[PDB]
Design a protein around this ligand. Structure first.
Ligand SMILES: *Cc1cc2c(cc1C)nc1c(=O)[nH]c(=O)nc-1n2C[C@H](O)[C@H](O)[C@H](O)COP(=O)(O)OP(=O)(O)OC[C@H]1O[C@@H](n2cnc3c(N)ncnc32)[C@H](O)[C@@H]1O
Ligand SMILES: *Cc1cc2c(cc1C)nc1c(=O)[nH]c(=O)nc-1n2C[C@H](O)[C@H](O)[C@H](O)COP(=O)(O)OP(=O)(O)OC[C@H]1O[C@@H](n2cnc3c(N)ncnc32)[C@H](O)[C@@H]1O
Ligand SMILES: CCCCCCCCCCCC[N+](C)(C)CCCS(=O)(=O)O
Ligand SMILES: CCCCCCCCCCCC[N+](C)(C)CCCS(=O)(=O)O
Ligand SMILES: Cc1ccc(NC(=O)c2coc3ccccc3c2=O)cc1C
Ligand SMILES: Cc1ccc(NC(=O)c2coc3ccccc3c2=O)cc1C
Lengths: 495, 500
């Protein structure tokens, strides 16, 4: 067998970040990666037609200081996603251009309803601890409802309910009826709230990495050299003896003092454990699916939308549209003009039956309607990735919690099992679901092991991160009216 | 490689029934079983204090003709669970004895609400095809709500909502907010409806096997000889070549024409697939958890409850009660007096933290109160099994579907993947979740392979079963008033219209 200090299962950002921290501390680490590549739910494709394109995770933004710091250390730079010109909200077959993060609403009743919806999501989030959402005062009540039930109670207008539904679908690649209200409200709150999570400028979608996000994992693999073993799916972990034994599908055996599991929680099912996992983890890893998304990038000769004072952001309501949300994917130089779109949740399942060429046609025709331009019908290239088909991801962007699961099983997610510690973005407390969360969790799991070895004190397990000098955060603000305008039933109680 | 016609993954009733059918038809079969035993979600413990006891699946009843025929062919016999004396409904800290399958309800408004609840569950069920629940006219609407939401709409009394909640918890070992309304409605309908599923006499809980249900799987293993390989967990299936390659954890390779996967759907995750599974199955197997239950058997010197004219059945509502349902588990000879109880859904998670001795004490104290009997505090022995801890089951009794999953992913549950066919009780269309469904699915999977091999025509894949001569099925009947009495909102409409 191959002996080392720590085996890290999974060579995504989380596993790589954990392995780098342990390596830098002087431990001998091995990373066992199932695929013939690193990066996991990140994947940057290079060819002459696109130069490079993120087909998985791409965006980073203010308050995501760990990913920004790690990438900077590895020699990467960011550029801003184009938001110079107007955004579009396409509603009932018409495009309404706008500025600022939220589409305007003109009907006074609809206005009150929309304002109340966003405000209430943040009000509720303030009572949910980031590190322990199951300790929310109404944890059980909120966990036993779906997001669909919550939106049905909160939204007096169909307009607000359709936009709220789109929000859930885009944020967590799942249907409102599939997900726990508690979990979803935690998810938003732990990215800094509604404004921060939905915003391009000053939010989660502000920036991309020059040359692609895949470079984070690739460049850590570059540092680690042959410590990274590709095409080594872990099948078996045995903790009955002095050292932990980790076996791969290609018949290799690794021996270590500790293990970090840096895979999505449910993919723990692909590993046979000796002794068996404790009851609560055994059942938890069957209760935590990942969402469904096809990421699609359509290329054009020029970023023609800019000529009509549109930035390329489209927010597209309704069942018929294949794609509910787009961003401009053009490179910083104004070349490789492109629109990135997501085919979300049930639509990913529905439209996966089509051919690549059939999806291209539907997207181009949609974009022609929304951008009001025949130029959208003349694509020069197309790339896509359906994450639902990946054996070693399970989906994208991340794991969702159905009703009842987070309160009953959430405490087990990052609880060590003897000498196995748990990384992965699902275990983060700030931007869980994102590349930022992957870094937080990997570095925390690594430091749990450093503490178990006696190398650092307990109070160094969780570590704050200085703010990025390159991507500083501006405060999230609200207006007096936003804070104090009544809800729809509030206006009725006054009548 | 060890060569054969068909590799069956899993030695539970479904895999063993499939293997038997294939073997009897002249094929060479191998059964690869992860555990050191066959039976899976069935397990019959034997020791001198209990003689034998079913710690997993136990009950069979009228309309479950496949398991009865299989068991009979293997030389097994049934006996009737004791329902001679009165049942007990324990609610708000008091016990109310009764006869008939449902506790009687006296308050007229509450009676209308209860009657409408059960009626409506069956009414909705009739809209749902047993073999394609996603084809129900309102499949989407019903699949996008939980059972909690449906009970909140349907039940105009707390009395009905509480009993309905216990019904869901007991039937599918899951909370009302955890499960899809469409899936639960399908599940009940495919067992023959509310009366059949809840009943002891004339229903699902009527009988047990003399000597334990584990004998079904054991006796098939005896017939198959060394074709059953114990402690062979499957880790890898490769369909890239002419013959299917199946690899086990202990480093053996098996080569076959076809494979039957006879394991719970989510446990497919423990196998690495080459090529990868198609998208819909890849995601489906991450979306289908099993329920949570501890099965607990408390032994006594005598079946003392019978002397108070109680049969041993207790239907126990309330958060403080660890166990919501009991049955008399005394042997047919009248010795090894015992009460079987289930600790359900969240309570299985909550009470797992205690010791065995602490759980025994809580159960005895509950039974003493419910039975009004100090004798319940004098147990002579205890056995239990927490199915939540089983790596190779995932839970019990069966797989549940959360909201939204059955309409999006249900169609791939028994869809073949190249040369892999799918058995397991989860893929049945009649008593899915039960030993019966395991037999149906195993035999159906085997015959899919026989059809693929050109050995039988397509119309023999699905095969009806003759009614048991030993366990005749009384029909499910209603009264005129049961059919036509209004719901609570229907009564309110009638009142509004009169007064107009
Ligand atoms: C898919 C996706 C993700 C995504 C998104 C859009 C799409 C289409 N957009 C994002 C965005 O704009 N900004 C952002 O910050 N995140 C975005 N996401 C999510 C993001 O990609 C993820 O949060 C992050 O990449 C997750 O990182 P983590 O390291 O936690 O997880 P992973 O990437 O899945 O890596 C796990 C690795 O483990 C390997 N594996 C799996 N099973 C095994 C076994 N048995 N043995 C050995 N290795 C295993 C995987 O192959 C993978 O490499
Ligand atoms: C657990 C339980 C079940 C149960 C019940 C009460 C409890 C506590 N009460 C029942 C009842 O009264 N009447 C009834 O008809 N059913 C009842 N249930 C359900 C019943 O036990 C199940 O429906 C039935 O036994 C399921 O049979 P099936 O053959 O479909 O599935 P299984 O028993 O789980 O068998 C699967 C076998 O596969 C093995 N396995 C798992 N993974 C692997 C891998 N990777 N490789 C090889 N083998 C694998 C398992 O070990 C098992 O033996
Ligand atoms: C009307 N809707 C918004 C449907 C329900 C109001 C909910 S509630 O009446 O405030 O409970
Ligand atoms: C008047 C309000 C009573 C609500 C009663 N419940 C049963 C709570 C809801 C009925 C829902 S539905 O109205 O039948 O759709
Ligand atoms: C009006 C509006 C604008 C942007 C958004 N965006 C989001 O919520 C996003 C949430 O998480 C993401 C994760 C990966 C990539 C993109 C996103 C979002 O844009 C939502 C609404 C309702
Ligand atoms: C009044 C009453 C009596 C029995 C039941 N029982 C049930 O629903 C059961 C359904 O599934 C089972 C599965 C395995 C073992 C036992 C059972 C039940 O008793 C329910 C009610 C509401």
């Amino acid at each position: 067998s191959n002996k080392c200090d720590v085996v890290v299962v999974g060579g995504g950002i989380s596993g790589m970040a954990a392995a780098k921290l342990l390596h830098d501390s002087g431990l001998n680490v091995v990373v066992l990666e199932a695929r013939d590549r690193v990066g996991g739910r990140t994947y940057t494709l290079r060819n002459q037609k696109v130069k490079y394109v993120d087909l998985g995770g791409s965006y980073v933004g203010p308050t995501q200081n760990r990913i920004l710091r790690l990438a900077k250390e590895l020699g990467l730079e960011t550029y801003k996603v184009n938001e110079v010109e107007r955004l579009i909200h396409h509603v009932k077959g018409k495009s309404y251009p706008f500025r600022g993060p939220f589409p305007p609403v003109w009907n006074p009743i609809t206005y009150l309803d929309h304002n109340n919806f966003w405000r209430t999501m943040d009000d509720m989030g303030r009572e949910i601890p980031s590190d322990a959402p199951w300790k929310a005062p109404l944890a059980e009540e909120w966990d036993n409802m779906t997001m669909k039930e919550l939106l049905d109670k909160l939204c007096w207008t169909e307009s607000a309910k359709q936009l709220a539904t789109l929000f859930v679908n885009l944020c967590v690649t799942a249907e409102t009826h599939e997900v726990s209200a508690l979990w979803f409200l935690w998810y938003v709150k732990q990215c800094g709230g509604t404004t921060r999570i939905i915003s391009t400028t000053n939010g989660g979608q502000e920036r991309k990495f020059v040359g692609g996000s895949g470079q984070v994992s690739e460049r850590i693999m570059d540092l680690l050299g042959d410590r990274v073993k590709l095409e080594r799916p872990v099948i078996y972990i045995d903790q009955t003896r002095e050292n932990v034994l980790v076996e791969t599908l290609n018949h290799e055996m690794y021996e270590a003092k500790y293990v970090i599991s840096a895979i999505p929680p449910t993919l723990g099912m692909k590993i046979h454990f000796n002794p068996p996992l404790p009851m609560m983890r055994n059942q938890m890893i069957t209760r935590v699916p990942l969402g469904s998304v096809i990421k699609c990038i359509v290329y054009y000769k020029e970023p023609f939308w800019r000529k009509k004072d549109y930035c390329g952001t489209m927010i597209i309501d309704g069942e018929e549209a294949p794609v509910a949300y787009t961003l401009d994917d053009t490179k910083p130089e104004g070349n490789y003009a492109a629109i990135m779109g997501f085919i979300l949740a049930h639509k990913a399942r529905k439209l996966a039956r089509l051919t690549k060429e059939e999806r291209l046609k539907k997207l181009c025709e949609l974009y022609a309607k929304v951008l009001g331009s025949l130029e959208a019908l003349e694509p020069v290239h197309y790339e896509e990735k359906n994450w639902c088909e990946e054996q070693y991801s399970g989906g994208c962007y991340t794991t969702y919690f159905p009703p009842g699961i987070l309160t009953q099983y959430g405490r087990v997610l990052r609880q060590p099992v003897d000498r196995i510690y748990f990384a992965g973005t699902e275990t983060a407390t700030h931007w869980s679901g994102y590349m930022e969360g992957a870094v937080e969790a990997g570095e925390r799991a690594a430091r749990e092991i450093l503490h178990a070895m006696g190398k650092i004190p307990e109070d160094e397990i969780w570590q704050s991160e200085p703010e990025s000098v390159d991507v500083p955060a501006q405060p999230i603000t609200t207006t007096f009216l936003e804070r104090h305008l009544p809800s729809v039933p509030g206006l009725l109680r006054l009548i």
